[PDB]
Design a protein around this ligand. Structure first.
Ligand SMILES: O=C(O)[C@H]1O[C@@H](Oc2ccc([N+](=O)[O-])cc2)[C@H](O)[C@@H](O)[C@@H]1O
Ligand SMILES: O=C(O)[C@H]1O[C@@H](Oc2ccc([N+](=O)[O-])cc2)[C@H](O)[C@@H](O)[C@@H]1O
Lengths: 141, 183
């Protein structure tokens, strides 16, 4: 079945995301870390990014795939929120933010950048990382 | 009109099955025409996608063609994203399927390049209108800022659970913090 193959690809895509956030972030401001995490998406293999978006499109017309993506996005956002709480205790970001919602909106900005066909060209401009820095630092402070 | 009935049937078949699995044959049966009538209006599946992209582009341009008055520009952008989470879900699914097809089809990638450029040009014009009114910082790169705002919009558009997230007050407040941060 097609759903079984998609589920295996989702776990592999999820694993690349978990590698960014599974460990405590030492010696790096969380705003600087989130900026580099989203900017580095533009340099991953394009066919790998295209496969993520193809599965995202399938999930919007396939309830079984939508359930797999709900689990994938839940898993990623819980780890991002944990690193967010670490930054709050270290005094790096505001202790008043809604970490669950903030992680979800950061993940949506992530997939919006991931799906941009011209993201690699935009990343060559200095205003690309600065604009992301202003968006990311804005919601975290 | 026959061209509209074709597009409506194509939007239904494309959204439910995707670009690859959709057939021109099934589109013909949906609106009760022959393949020759369909070919006369749209010669290929890519020609259909081109017309659908223009329909979606016009919905975006409908939000930014006229000047924004009575509401702050930051809140207008946030309201536009919030309202998008309430649109027909099959319509959102088609936008993402076209974006997915554009990453594997250079014909569609060229169409999306024109659509996204046209949208950011209108958003940037409203950005300059907001700069003259003192609502936005005057020192922003309007071109890059518009594209990043469009990417955040498509990320929310592609979130299957976006309408559930919109039920909470922290959703719009988080968007205001993001959009207010870059502007
Ligand atoms: O989930 C995914 O499919 C993608 O996640 C990416 O890592 C993340 C970066 C930032 C955020 N965020 O700002 O939320 C979440 C995850 C991987 O680099 C990518 O290879 C993978 O395809
Ligand atoms: O482009 C598109 O396909 C979609 O655009 C949406 O309108 C926008 C809203 C906010 C922003 N923004 O904040 O950059 C840009 C455009 C339409 O409601 C939607 O029907 C259409 O499918």
């Amino acid at each position: 079945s097609k759903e079984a193959l998609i589920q295996a690809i989702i776990l592999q895509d999820q694993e690349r995301a978990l590698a960014r956030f599974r460990e405590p972030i030492e010696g790096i401001h969380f705003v600087d870390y989130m900026v580099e995490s989203i900017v580095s998406l533009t340099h991953e293999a394009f066919g790998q990014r295209a496969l993520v978006v193809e599965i995202m499109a399938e999930g919007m017309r396939n309830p079984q795939v939508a359930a797999m993506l709900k689990n994938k996005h839940m898993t990623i956002t819980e780890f991002v929120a944990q690193r967010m709480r670490d930054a709050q205790q270290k005094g790096e970001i505001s202790p008043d933010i809604n970490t669950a919602m903030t992680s979800r909106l950061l993940l949506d900005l992530t997939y919006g950048v991931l799906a941009d066909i011209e993201a690699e060209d935009l990343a060559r401009e200095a205003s690309f990382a600065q604009g992301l820095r202003a968006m990311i630092g804005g919601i975290l402070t």
